[PDB]
Curated annotation (Swiss-Prot):
It comes from the Eukaryota. Transmembrane segments: none annotated. This is DnaJ homolog subfamily B member 1. Interacts with HSP70 and can stimulate its ATPase activity. Stimulates the association between HSC70 and HIP. Negatively regulates heat shock-induced HSF1 transcriptional activity during the attenuation and recovery phase period of the heat shock response. Stimulates ATP hydrolysis and the folding of unfolded proteins mediated by HSPA1A/B (in vitro). Coiled coil: none annotated. It comes from Homo sapiens (Human). Residues 2-70 form the J domain.
């Protein structure tokens, strides 16, 4: 339905940076390799990692915040052109994967 980052974190849209980190920890633990091994859920984890990605990274934070998810995937206000993609397909920037951030922050623990 909706790829609401806060709903994928599992908290209120008006939550705090700290709560976003903690909420993210729960979710990253939820889909941690040693906790959950399922195809598609691995992609859900990417979507959650993406959710946080922007919450941790001001560079996509403004974007998400400004327009939302569609303005980051390439289907928002200029949907179809995806910024400069023009005719090129493009998923969420899962390259930006704060499982390295997570591994650094919490290390896959509580």
């Amino acid at each position: 339905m909706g790829k609401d980052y806060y709903q994928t974190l599992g908290l209120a849209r008006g939550a705090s940076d700290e709560e976003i980190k903690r909420a993210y920890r729960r979710q990253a633990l939820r889909y941690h390799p040693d906790k959950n091994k399922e195809p598609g859920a691995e992609e859900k984890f990417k979507e959650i990692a993406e959710a946080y990605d922007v919450l941790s990274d001001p560079r996509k934070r403004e974007i998400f915040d400004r327009y939302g998810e569609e303005g980051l995937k390439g289907s928002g206000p200029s949907g179809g052109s995806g910024g400069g993609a023009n005719g090129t397909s493009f998923s969420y920037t899962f390259h930006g994967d704060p499982h390295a951030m997570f591994a650094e922050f919490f290390g896959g623990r509580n």
